[PDB]
């Protein structure tokens, strides 16, 4: 949770997804027998590989050094009582406005940071 | 670049059992500790065999145990036999001697006959208490190549192995290529 470095912030888009709407952006390994991308010719897009993996100490951490724990109710927030300096509460999208208020209050009581407050 | 040729790179051995038996996991836990905190080759032998598959851990019968521990120049008189595997009975041995055996499993008949003859049966954790380094122990194994598949492995011209045949008799692979009167023999 100190000095968080990302080896890369660009997302690795699928080859030719910029040219055909039928080709989604989500990454696919090119397997063509002539593929210039698979062969890594200069000037082509990069492919995901294990060398891009981030430091094990800072992996998964948000910029503030915390990791965003999803919470669906008050009891999920109570799970983060002792882990106040390592986990932040992320309130689920399908939690009602009433329950969301009770969650925000419980997190504030425990000193748990909430990523999506408001 | 570096010119490295890599043949024995990844070790080929099991580092843990494939079994999900929780009690086998407890025995491994015991013998991981014993093999690490002692200088005994016996404990490393037990730990390694606790990982092995069923086919690599053949059974042994009480007859073989009785024979192996009763040789003329033995001195294996009052020592505990240990096998990481199943101890079966041999009903052909009409009178069982007094034996001390430590094993993973005992067949119901093997266990009853060992006890009735005044002997004793131990699990491997009981063995660890009695001989924490395996001192004055006879470590034994069953016959690895007694299983059916080894009748067939290596079959080929003039190898004298067993063929894979659906049935046995004349008309089932005893003709051309198996005798001189039919072209050639093997």
């Amino acid at each position: 949770a100190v000095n968080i470095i990302k080896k890369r912030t660009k997302p690795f888009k699928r080859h030719q997804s910029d040219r055909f709407k039928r080709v989604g952006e989500s990454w696919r390994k090119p397997r063509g027998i002539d593929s210039c991308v698979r062969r890594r010719f200069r000037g082509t897009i990069s492919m995901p590989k294990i060398g891009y993996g981030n430091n094990k100490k800072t992996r998964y951490c948000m910029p503030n050094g915390l990791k965003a724990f999803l919470v669906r109710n008050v009891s999920d927030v109570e799970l983060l009582l002792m882990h106040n300096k390592t986990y932040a509460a992320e309130i689920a999208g399908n939690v009602s406005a009433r329950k969301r208020v009770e969650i925000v209050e419980k997190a504030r009581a425990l000193g748990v940071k909430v990523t999506n407050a408001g | 670049g570096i010119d490295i040729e890599r043949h024995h790179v990844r070790k080929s051995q099991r580092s843990k059992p494939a079994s999900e038996n929780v009690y086998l996991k407890l025995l491994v836990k015991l013998y991981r500790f014993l093999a690490r905190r002692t200088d005994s080759r016996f404990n490393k032998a037990i730990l390694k065999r606790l990982f092995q598959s069923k086919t690599n851990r053949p059974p042994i019968s009480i007859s073989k145990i009785a024979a192996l521990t009763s040789r003329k120049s033995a001195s294996l008189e009052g020592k505990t036999t240990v096998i990481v595997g199943t101890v079966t009975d041999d009903e052909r041995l009409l009178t069982v001697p007094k034996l001390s055996v430590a094993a993973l499993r005992f067949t119901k008949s093997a266990r009853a006959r060992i006890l009735k003859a005044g002997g004793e049966v131990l699990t491997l954790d009981q063995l660890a208490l009695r001989a924490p380094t395996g001192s004055n122990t006879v470590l034994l194994r069953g016959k690895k190549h007694a299983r059916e598949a080894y009748r067939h492995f290596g079959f080929g011209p003039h190898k004298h192995k067993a063929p894979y045949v659906r049935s046995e008799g004349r008309k089932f692979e005893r003709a051309r290529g198996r005798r001189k009167s039919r072209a050639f023999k093997v």
Binding site: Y60, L70, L79, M82 | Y23
Partner: protein, 134 residues
């Protein structure tokens, strides 16, 4: 009589009502059982295994209740297995000292004094009045 505590952990290390496991962050696990002060899924902190174990829960409206497991003769009697001592209306200095005495100075779970005090501290911090900022 006893079913082994090692055996119980093997059964419940990945399957129990009190374990909340998520695949995020590479696989985190939380333990929610009442007699687990640390809140982490491990054999030594699980009250379901250990003959001696402690838990610190919140007591309404102030203070904490110290939960402890009685002598293992009650292992088969769940009604007599858990002891719940209400340490409430004491100050923070008084509360931590009693927890340390009951758990540590008795030799019960000396390994769990620090975690228990920290857990009681956090519960007490959660119960304080809210200085709401209008």
């Amino acid at each position: 009589m006893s079913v082994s505590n090692d055996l119980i952990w093997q059964v419940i290390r990945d399957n129990n009502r009190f374990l909340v496991k998520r695949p995020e962050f590479g696989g985190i696990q939380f333990n929610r059982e009442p007699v687990n002060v640390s809140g982490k899924n491990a054999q030594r902190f699980s009250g379901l295994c250990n003959d001696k174990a402690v838990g610190v829960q919140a007591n309404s409206p102030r203070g904490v209740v110290l939960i402890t497991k009685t002598n293992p003769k009650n292992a088969q009697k769940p009604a007599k297995l858990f002891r719940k001592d209400v340490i409430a209306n004491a100050s923070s200095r008084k509360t931590y000292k009693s927890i340390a005495g009951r758990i540590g100075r008795t030799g019960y779970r000396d390994d769990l004094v620090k975690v228990s005090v920290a857990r009681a501290s956090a519960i007490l911090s959660s119960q304080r009045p809210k200085k709401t900022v209008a």
